[PDB]
Amino acid sequence: GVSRAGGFVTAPVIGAMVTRPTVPRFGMRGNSTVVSNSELILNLTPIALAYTVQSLPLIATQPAWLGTIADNYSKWRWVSLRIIYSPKCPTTTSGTVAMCLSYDRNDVAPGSRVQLSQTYKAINFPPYAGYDGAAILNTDVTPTSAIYVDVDVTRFDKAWYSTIGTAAFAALTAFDQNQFCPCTVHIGSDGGPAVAVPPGDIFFKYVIELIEPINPTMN
Amino acid sequence: GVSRAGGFVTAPVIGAMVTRPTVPRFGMRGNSTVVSNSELILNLTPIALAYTVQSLPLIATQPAWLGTIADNYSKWRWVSLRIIYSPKCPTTTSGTVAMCLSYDRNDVAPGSRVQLSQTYKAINFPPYAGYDGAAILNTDVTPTSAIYVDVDVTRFDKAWYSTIGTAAFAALTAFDQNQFCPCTVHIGSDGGPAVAVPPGDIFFKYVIELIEPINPTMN
Amino acid sequence: STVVSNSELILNLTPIALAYTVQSLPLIATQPAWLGTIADNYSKWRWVSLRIIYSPKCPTTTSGTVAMCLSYDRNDVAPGSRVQLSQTYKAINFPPYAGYDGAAILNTDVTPTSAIYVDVDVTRFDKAWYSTIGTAAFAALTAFDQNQFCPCTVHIGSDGGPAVAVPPGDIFFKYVIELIEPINPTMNV
Amino acid sequence: GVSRAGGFVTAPVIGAMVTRPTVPRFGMRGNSTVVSNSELILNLTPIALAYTVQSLPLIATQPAWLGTIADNYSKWRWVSLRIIYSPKCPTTTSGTVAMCLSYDRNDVAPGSRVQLSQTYKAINFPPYAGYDGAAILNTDVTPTSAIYVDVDVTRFDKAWYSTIGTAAFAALTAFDQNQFCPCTVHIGSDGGPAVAVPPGDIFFKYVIELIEPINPTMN
Amino acid sequence: NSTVVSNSELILNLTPIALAYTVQSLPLIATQPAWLGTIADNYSKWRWVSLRIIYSPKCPTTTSGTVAMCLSYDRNDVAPGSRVQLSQTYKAINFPPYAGYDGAAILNTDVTPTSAIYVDVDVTRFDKAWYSTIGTAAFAALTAFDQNQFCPCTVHIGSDGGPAVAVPPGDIFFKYVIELIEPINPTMN
Amino acid sequence: NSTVVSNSELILNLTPIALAYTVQSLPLIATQPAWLGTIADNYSKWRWVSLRIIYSPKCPTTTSGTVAMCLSYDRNDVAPGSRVQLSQTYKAINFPPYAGYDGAAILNTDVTPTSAIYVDVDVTRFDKAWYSTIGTAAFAALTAFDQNQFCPCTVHIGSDGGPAVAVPPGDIFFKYVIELIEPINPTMN
Ligand SMILES: [Ca+2]
Ligand SMILES: [Ca+2]
Ligand SMILES: [Ca+2]
Ligand SMILES: [Ca+2]
Ligand SMILES: [Ca+2]
Ligand SMILES: [Ca+2]
Ligand SMILES: [Ca+2]
Ligand SMILES: [Ca+2]
Ligand SMILES: [Ca+2]
Ligand SMILES: [Ca+2]
Ligand SMILES: [Ca+2]
């Protein structure tokens, strides 16, 4: 790379992904139903000078489309969960966007980018970057220029989680939420322009295993 | 059979199916999602002397479990739909239960068993019968002693139907319902005892193809 | 590690009548009366195997249908009909006199062809071990707190019974449970 | 079975065994005399709504025919003891009959079916069932539809027991009885009809080894 | 099929050691230990798989005297009337009331410290294979001869040579492994 | 990737031993030990890889009485009300207040002297794989049920039979190996 052999860098006016059209794929693994799909989950708050954060609980019901399928199953577990960033602003946008993971709903969100950076899986990056890694979303490859976070799905506290709707989940105390949620992602930013600029969006690319069907009304 | 070679008939006190435990199976057929499953759909009104009828529209959203999966798809079509009867009363129960099919939500339900019998696919049978044909439900075989109706899925008026929830469907006029429903089943009975007796239940064994995913909130 | 195995009567089902009824049981070490007293002496436990068996006790002339299924969140609403129950994991529908020919399953390692039962998917619980808690203490908890002590719940519903309700049968548990960490019962339960 | 693959069940008006005529068989095993035979031991109390129990000590002298042969021997031991149920009522009889084993004559008999069910070898069953397992009595096969209890003959407290007549045994205290008796069977019932109905009978199918002959007057 | 239970329990607080001799005896039955008793009530028969009687001191090293333990096998025997009589009996071990503090690990580990004070019962040489479960209260109401039917062994703990003002010497614990068979309702048992 | 931390720390000065019984309890959480707590605040989850609770005497051999330790696994349990109740509980070890001086090496070496007084926690039999880090102050403000979510085990230390004038018996130390994963800012944690 440039840090060993030297090189040169250039920058275009702007760059962005074009998402490949797809359909959620279903599969059976014995009595288990496996769903593989990608979903746009969040539009980030316009990046400005001051710091700001957004958080999302990583539960089966968070992605709206998957959420529906989950209502018919009692338990689930993430087989793989990759959080991907997609820029939507020009290379003239100053600032830094960062993401990280937490595992206790009683936690307080990172109050600054320094706090966020000390945390697990923290990745800091310019708001305009990430387009070169489009393949991470459209294919199963992992480009080195892609901006993403892989969740340590094998290091959760429980083996399976019970399905719960987002509204009901929201109404729980942090402690009761802990029983239905294995992890939460935080996305923060700062150092942006005086006139805030929408930086990018967040996608979830996942493979989930759902078990033990249940009447949706009961669940 | 007995009608050609003679024989003898006997009758037990009672007989009933024991349903095999199963899980709904998912499959992909290109961009299409195929669901194969069986569901208990209706407990029949206790059979008594006077005639009575119950009707169910044959839409993707009628079976509660399937209904949930259908919310995520714009269009669907029955690949196969077999309506099965399961008795729950002793052989001492007098009367006849009958089923038939109609194709216009503006139709008036059969007012008597004679009206019902003239209709397409009408099958008349004692309320206590049907147990000997348990395999029709638990396997893919079709016993001659099974009591069922196969829907002529290839002779519907349209190629695909749009998904619509049962509540919203119920609120439509018969004519607007016709655009979302290809067929309706009627189940009637009469000639039962003075003290009415719950005769049996109705199961749907189906294979459905769902196409064109959609956000559930939009659908 | 102490391993206990036995079967015992757990519940006399409500008389089967025209209208639908459901009875639910949390699958906990303290639910079976005989096992409960042994469980009170241990801090944690886990089902090694749990088989829920139905035993009929009604005349064969009894109309109606019975069903069982399993759920895994105490915060769930119990099935309001056999149509809802029937769509739930491991559901099995059978007549109230079913199983009269398979009683041996209760006291032998044989599984008679005609026996009516449900094997719990013990390997797919959310935790490795569950703490012992007495039945009455359990009842007083919120659904959320119950979830920490209970891995599964079984529902038994029926409908289509006769005008004069008839006791259909009973529910038995045949289990193999592993108990660890002795404890004084007063401290525990 | 039906619980895995589904199926159907039917019930006849009634069913009962027809016992094969036999003769008690004698054999020598060195200096030991071995007797193999089956005997009707008890007519059960008519099953009614309320609970009732009957108990029998499992001693060599309990079966009347064997009892005579035992008078000529000082010691004995059960090689095998199978307790079998034989129904004598129609399938319309409600209720449950249960059997179990105890090993201390100082024990109090089960006061209810719940108490009985917690006990060793407890088997609960409808009073009309058991006919399908007729072969367990007439042959050496063990049908799965047979209703029976096998005594754990290898887990008794002593290796041999002394022969004692039933009258003399009855006159002993529970503690002195313990020296001559290795086990006792309890048969209870409840949930029967308002008009009590004789449910069935109990047979003992055994193989016993008798040793050390003695003048009957001394014994 | 059988259940194996393992635990250790405090069984008896010894009477204060004084100049004169005293003896206490305990029947080695499954029902003697309070915690075990509850589990045992649920099984018809049992047999000690392993039984170690342990002494734990609770007095200062300034305490004089001798505490001694031994085993007998007939409830009709007379208890030892002196340390001499006790000392002639099987497994007799004599020691000062403060002995055993350097071997306390023996209580909750599989270690057997050479400084521990214990008696290992010859579990394989009892008169019969299994013993029927019986409550302590009922047991005490029996004649010595009827007690033998339920009790395979008894331990006697005597002492003397203590101070003018009696001093509580220590306690007796049972660390055991017992096998239980043939479940039964406790009320019947 | 994870970080493994090893050290031993003084955790609790025991309340002076007197005639009457007293109990103290400590939650076995990563945040309980003061030194470890600082490191733990920097990681989201943890799990004890090894945990040995050690007793160190600080009183003369002239001190009478008994100190005992045991383990429980539900914050909703009631603490042992007597040495009898305590002694029936898992890993219970009883000993005089001056015991353990010949085994002090256990504290700073990999040696396990047979004269040492300790409790080895069954670290592989906790209800779940990982536990989330939580401060002691916050932990104490939780209900017993919410505490269980963060605490896998608790140790109880009781005593009695001591002198008329209470004597500080000793201290409790934790010698541990803990694995920490998923870094996090302490303020968030
Ligand atoms: Ca970091
Ligand atoms: Ca749920
Ligand atoms: Ca027709
Ligand atoms: Ca629509
Ligand atoms: Ca507890
Ligand atoms: Ca039993
Ligand atoms: Ca004699
Ligand atoms: Ca000696
Ligand atoms: Ca007894
Ligand atoms: Ca203990
Ligand atoms: Ca935390």
Side-chain angles (χ1 to χ4, degrees), chain A residues 1-107 109-219, chain B residues 1-107 109-219, chain C residues 1-76 78-189, chain D residues 1-107 109-219, chain E residues 2-6 8-77 79-189, chain F residues 2-6 8-77 79-189:
Chain A
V2 299
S3 290
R4 305 290 185 90
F8 66 85
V9 283
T10 54
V13 175
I14 189 165
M17 304 179 176
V18 171
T19 63
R20 170 224 277 194
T22 194
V23 133
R25 311 269 131 194
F26 283 86
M28 298 296 297
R29 180 190 157 263
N31 263 9
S32 300
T33 303
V34 194
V35 182
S36 350
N37 189 47
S38 287
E39 288 185 42
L40 165 64
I41 304 281
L42 187 72
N43 300 140
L44 292 175
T45 307
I47 190 170
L49 183 55
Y51 174 85
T52 190
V53 221
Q54 294 164 270
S55 303
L56 288 164
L58 305 178
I59 50 166
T61 227
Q62 181 58 53
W65 204 86
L66 214 205
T68 297
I69 310 310
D71 299 341
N72 277 11
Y73 295 93
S74 297
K75 300 214 297 282
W76 63 272
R77 70 183 190 195
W78 292 125
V79 165
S80 59
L81 213 192
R82 175 171 279 182
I83 301 147
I84 300 166
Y85 180 80
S86 179
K88 84 209 286 183
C89 59
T91 70
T92 46
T93 319
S94 62
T96 305
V97 178
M99 305 187 256
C100 67
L101 304 174
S102 57
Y103 306 84
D104 191 333
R105 292 295 289 192
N106 193 216
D107 284 354
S112 64
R113 200 158 55 75
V114 172
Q115 289 191 357
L116 190 156
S117 296
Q118 301 169 357
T119 308
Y120 188 60
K121 282 293 176 176
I123 180 171
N124 285 250
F125 48 88
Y128 64 80
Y131 57 88
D132 269 327
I136 202 166
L137 213 242
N138 309 132
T139 73
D140 300 297
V141 185
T142 303
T144 50
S145 52
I147 295 173
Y148 65 103
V149 175
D150 277 336
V151 180
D152 52 328
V153 158
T154 59
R155 305 200 297 183
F156 294 156
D157 68 321
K158 302 213 290 60
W160 293 94
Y161 291 87
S162 196
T163 304
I164 192 175
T166 55
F169 177 79
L172 305 183
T173 52
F175 304 110
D176 282 333
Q177 291 186 340
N178 282 340
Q179 75 173 246
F180 297 101
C181 181
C183 187
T184 288
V185 58
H186 309 288
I187 310 133
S189 65
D190 76 355
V195 168
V197 164
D201 307 298
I202 255 56
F203 287 77
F204 278 14
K205 188 169 175 163
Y206 55 79
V207 186
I208 184 177
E209 177 177 358
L210 314 163
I211 65 174
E212 304 148 344
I214 186 179
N215 162 262
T217 306
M218 286 158 74
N219 205 35
Chain B
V2 299
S3 290
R4 305 290 185 90
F8 66 85
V9 283
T10 54
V13 175
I14 189 165
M17 304 178 176
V18 171
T19 63
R20 170 225 277 194
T22 194
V23 133
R25 311 269 131 194
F26 283 86
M28 298 296 297
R29 180 190 157 263
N31 263 9
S32 300
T33 303
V34 194
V35 182
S36 350
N37 189 47
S38 287
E39 288 185 42
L40 165 64
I41 304 281
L42 187 72
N43 300 140
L44 292 175
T45 307
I47 190 170
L49 183 55
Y51 174 85
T52 190
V53 221
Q54 294 164 270
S55 303
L56 288 164
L58 305 178
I59 50 166
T61 227
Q62 181 58 53
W65 204 86
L66 214 205
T68 297
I69 310 310
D71 299 341
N72 277 11
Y73 295 93
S74 297
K75 300 214 297 282
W76 63 272
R77 70 183 190 195
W78 292 125
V79 165
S80 59
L81 213 192
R82 175 171 279 182
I83 301 147
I84 300 166
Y85 180 80
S86 179
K88 84 209 286 183
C89 59
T91 70
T92 46
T93 319
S94 62
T96 305
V97 178
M99 305 187 256
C100 67
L101 304 174
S102 57
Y103 306 84
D104 191 333
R105 292 295 289 192
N106 193 216
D107 284 354
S112 64
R113 200 158 55 75
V114 172
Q115 289 191 357
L116 190 156
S117 296
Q118 301 169 357
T119 308
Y120 188 60
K121 282 293 176 176
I123 180 171
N124 285 250
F125 48 88
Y128 64 80
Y131 57 88
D132 269 327
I136 202 166
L137 213 242
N138 309 132
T139 73
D140 300 297
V141 185
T142 303
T144 50
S145 52
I147 295 173
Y148 65 103
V149 175
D150 277 336
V151 180
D152 52 328
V153 158
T154 59
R155 305 200 297 183
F156 294 156
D157 68 321
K158 302 213 290 60
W160 293 94
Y161 291 87
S162 196
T163 304
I164 192 175
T166 55
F169 177 79
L172 305 183
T173 52
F175 304 110
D176 282 333
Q177 291 186 340
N178 282 340
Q179 75 173 246
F180 297 101
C181 181
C183 187
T184 288
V185 58
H186 310 288
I187 310 133
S189 65
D190 76 355
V195 168
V197 164
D201 307 298
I202 255 56
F203 287 77
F204 278 14
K205 188 169 175 163
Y206 55 79
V207 186
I208 184 177
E209 177 177 358
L210 314 163
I211 65 174
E212 304 148 344
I214 186 179
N215 162 262
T217 306
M218 286 158 74
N219 205 35
Chain C
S1 185
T2 296
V3 295
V4 176
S5 304
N6 194 21
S7 64
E8 51 180 302
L9 203 181
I10 306 302
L11 175 84
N12 298 132
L13 298 177
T14 44
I16 190 173
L18 198 236
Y20 168 89
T21 1
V22 229
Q23 281 168 292
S24 303
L25 296 170
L27 301 179
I28 52 171
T30 237
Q31 187 59 233
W34 182 88
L35 211 212
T37 130
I38 292 175
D40 295 339
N41 268 22
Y42 292 91
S43 284
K44 296 208 293 295
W45 59 272
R46 68 172 176 198
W47 295 121
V48 172
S49 54
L50 178 60
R51 177 171 275 185
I52 306 161
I53 306 165
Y54 176 86
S55 180
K57 70 183 173 192
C58 65
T60 56
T61 49
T62 310
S63 62
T65 310
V66 186
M68 307 190 258
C69 71
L70 312 176
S71 60
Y72 311 73
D73 184 354
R74 299 293 295 179
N75 185 233
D76 288 348
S81 62
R82 200 156 52 72
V83 162
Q84 295 192 346
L85 190 165
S86 201
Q87 302 163 17
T88 307
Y89 195 51
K90 285 172 169 291
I92 187 171
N93 295 273
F94 50 91
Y97 54 86
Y100 63 81
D101 245 7
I105 197 179
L106 290 168
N107 72 349
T108 71
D109 292 313
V110 89
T111 308
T113 280
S114 42
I116 301 298
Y117 66 85
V118 169
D119 281 320
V120 181
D121 57 328
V122 139
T123 57
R124 291 185 304 179
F125 290 158
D126 64 311
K127 291 204 295 187
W129 296 90
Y130 289 84
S131 187
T132 301
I133 189 173
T135 270
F138 183 77
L141 307 184
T142 56
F144 303 106
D145 286 340
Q146 292 183 338
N147 286 334
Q148 75 175 245
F149 300 103
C150 179
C152 189
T153 294
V154 64
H155 308 275
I156 310 98
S158 62
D159 57 53
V164 177
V166 179
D170 306 314
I171 288 302
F172 286 73
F173 284 177
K174 188 185 188 186
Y175 53 78
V176 178
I177 186 168
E178 189 178 347
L179 303 156
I180 60 170
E181 307 148 348
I183 189 167
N184 161 261
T186 301
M187 290 169 59
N188 201 25
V189 174
Chain D
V2 299
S3 290
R4 305 290 185 90
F8 66 85
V9 283
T10 54
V13 175
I14 189 165
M17 304 178 176
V18 171
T19 63
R20 170 225 277 194
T22 194
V23 133
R25 311 269 131 194
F26 283 86
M28 298 296 297
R29 180 190 157 263
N31 263 9
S32 300
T33 303
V34 194
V35 182
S36 350
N37 189 47
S38 287
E39 288 185 42
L40 165 64
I41 304 281
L42 187 72
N43 300 140
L44 292 175
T45 307
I47 190 170
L49 183 55
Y51 174 85
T52 190
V53 221
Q54 294 164 270
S55 303
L56 288 164
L58 305 178
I59 50 166
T61 227
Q62 181 58 53
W65 204 86
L66 214 205
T68 297
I69 310 310
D71 299 341
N72 277 11
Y73 295 93
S74 297
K75 300 214 297 282
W76 63 272
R77 70 183 190 195
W78 292 125
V79 165
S80 59
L81 213 192
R82 175 171 279 182
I83 301 147
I84 300 166
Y85 180 80
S86 179
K88 84 209 286 183
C89 59
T91 70
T92 46
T93 319
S94 62
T96 305
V97 178
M99 305 187 256
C100 67
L101 304 174
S102 57
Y103 306 84
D104 191 333
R105 292 295 289 192
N106 193 216
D107 284 354
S112 64
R113 200 158 55 75
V114 172
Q115 289 191 357
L116 190 156
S117 296
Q118 301 169 357
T119 308
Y120 188 60
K121 282 293 176 176
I123 180 171
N124 285 250
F125 48 88
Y128 64 80
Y131 57 88
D132 269 327
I136 202 166
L137 213 242
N138 309 132
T139 73
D140 300 297
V141 185
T142 303
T144 50
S145 52
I147 295 173
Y148 65 103
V149 175
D150 277 336
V151 180
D152 52 328
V153 158
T154 59
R155 305 200 297 183
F156 294 156
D157 68 321
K158 302 213 290 60
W160 293 94
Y161 291 87
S162 196
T163 304
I164 192 175
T166 55
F169 177 79
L172 305 183
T173 52
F175 304 110
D176 282 333
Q177 291 186 340
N178 282 340
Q179 75 173 246
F180 297 101
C181 181
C183 187
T184 288
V185 58
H186 310 288
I187 310 133
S189 65
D190 76 355
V195 168
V197 164
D201 307 298
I202 255 56
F203 287 77
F204 278 14
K205 188 169 175 163
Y206 55 79
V207 186
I208 184 177
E209 177 177 358
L210 314 163
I211 65 174
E212 304 148 344
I214 186 179
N215 162 262
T217 306
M218 286 158 74
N219 205 35
Chain E
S2 52
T3 298
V4 299
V5 174
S6 305
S8 62
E9 304 185 35
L10 197 184
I11 310 293
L12 179 76
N13 291 149
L14 301 180
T15 59
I17 190 178
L19 185 56
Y21 174 83
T22 30
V23 228
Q24 290 172 98
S25 306
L26 293 162
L28 302 183
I29 59 183
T31 262
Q32 183 54 233
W35 182 91
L36 218 203
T38 301
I39 296 170
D41 292 330
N42 276 20
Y43 292 88
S44 280
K45 303 219 291 290
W46 60 271
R47 73 179 174 185
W48 292 121
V49 165
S50 178
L51 216 204
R52 167 174 289 183
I53 300 163
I54 296 165
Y55 175 81
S56 190
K58 65 189 176 185
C59 61
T61 56
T62 45
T63 318
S64 68
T66 307
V67 177
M69 315 191 255
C70 77
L71 304 176
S72 61
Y73 303 79
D74 182 355
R75 298 293 293 180
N76 187 226
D77 291 340
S82 66
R83 265 212 303 126
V84 174
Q85 291 190 177
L86 186 161
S87 292
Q88 295 171 356
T89 305
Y90 184 60
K91 283 295 173 181
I93 180 182
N94 284 247
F95 49 94
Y98 55 83
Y101 65 87
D102 275 337
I106 194 177
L107 283 167
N108 70 347
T109 70
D110 288 315
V111 179
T112 311
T114 53
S115 39
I117 303 289
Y118 60 96
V119 168
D120 277 319
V121 184
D122 55 337
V123 142
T124 56
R125 306 192 302 185
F126 292 155
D127 68 310
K128 57 190 206 173
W130 299 90
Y131 290 84
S132 204
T133 297
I134 186 176
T136 52
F139 178 81
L142 297 181
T143 58
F145 305 109
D146 285 350
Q147 285 183 348
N148 286 334
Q149 172 185 142
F150 301 100
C151 184
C153 190
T154 294
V155 58
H156 305 281
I157 312 91
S159 61
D160 65 9
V165 178
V167 172
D171 303 315
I172 289 302
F173 291 78
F174 285 2
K175 186 178 175 194
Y176 54 75
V177 185
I178 189 177
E179 184 173 7
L180 302 148
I181 61 177
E182 304 152 345
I184 187 176
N185 168 266
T187 303
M188 293 165 60
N189 206 24
Chain F
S2 52
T3 298
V4 299
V5 174
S6 305
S8 62
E9 304 185 35
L10 197 184
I11 310 293
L12 179 76
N13 291 149
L14 301 180
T15 59
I17 190 178
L19 185 56
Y21 174 83
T22 30
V23 228
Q24 290 172 98
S25 306
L26 293 162
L28 302 183
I29 59 183
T31 262
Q32 183 54 233
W35 182 91
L36 218 203
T38 301
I39 296 170
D41 292 330
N42 276 20
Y43 292 88
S44 280
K45 303 219 291 290
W46 60 271
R47 73 179 174 185
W48 292 121
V49 165
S50 178
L51 216 204
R52 167 174 289 183
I53 300 163
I54 296 165
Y55 175 81
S56 190
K58 65 189 176 185
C59 61
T61 56
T62 45
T63 318
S64 68
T66 307
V67 177
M69 315 191 255
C70 77
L71 304 176
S72 61
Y73 303 79
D74 182 355
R75 298 293 293 180
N76 187 226
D77 291 340
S82 66
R83 265 212 303 126
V84 174
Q85 291 190 177
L86 186 161
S87 292
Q88 295 171 356
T89 305
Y90 184 60
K91 283 295 173 181
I93 180 182
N94 284 247
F95 49 94
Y98 55 83
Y101 65 87
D102 275 337
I106 194 177
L107 283 167
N108 70 347
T109 70
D110 288 315
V111 179
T112 311
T114 53
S115 39
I117 303 289
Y118 60 96
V119 168
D120 277 319
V121 184
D122 55 337
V123 142
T124 56
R125 306 192 302 185
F126 292 155
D127 68 310
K128 57 190 206 173
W130 299 90
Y131 290 84
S132 204
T133 297
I134 186 176
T136 52
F139 178 81
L142 297 181
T143 58
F145 305 109
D146 285 350
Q147 285 183 348
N148 286 334
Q149 172 185 142
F150 301 100
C151 184
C153 190
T154 294
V155 58
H156 305 281
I157 312 91
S159 61
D160 65 9
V165 178
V167 172
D171 303 315
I172 289 302
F173 291 78
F174 285 2
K175 186 178 175 194
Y176 54 75
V177 185
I178 189 177
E179 184 173 7
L180 302 148
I181 61 177
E182 304 152 345
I184 187 176
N185 168 266
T187 303
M188 293 165 60
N189 206 24

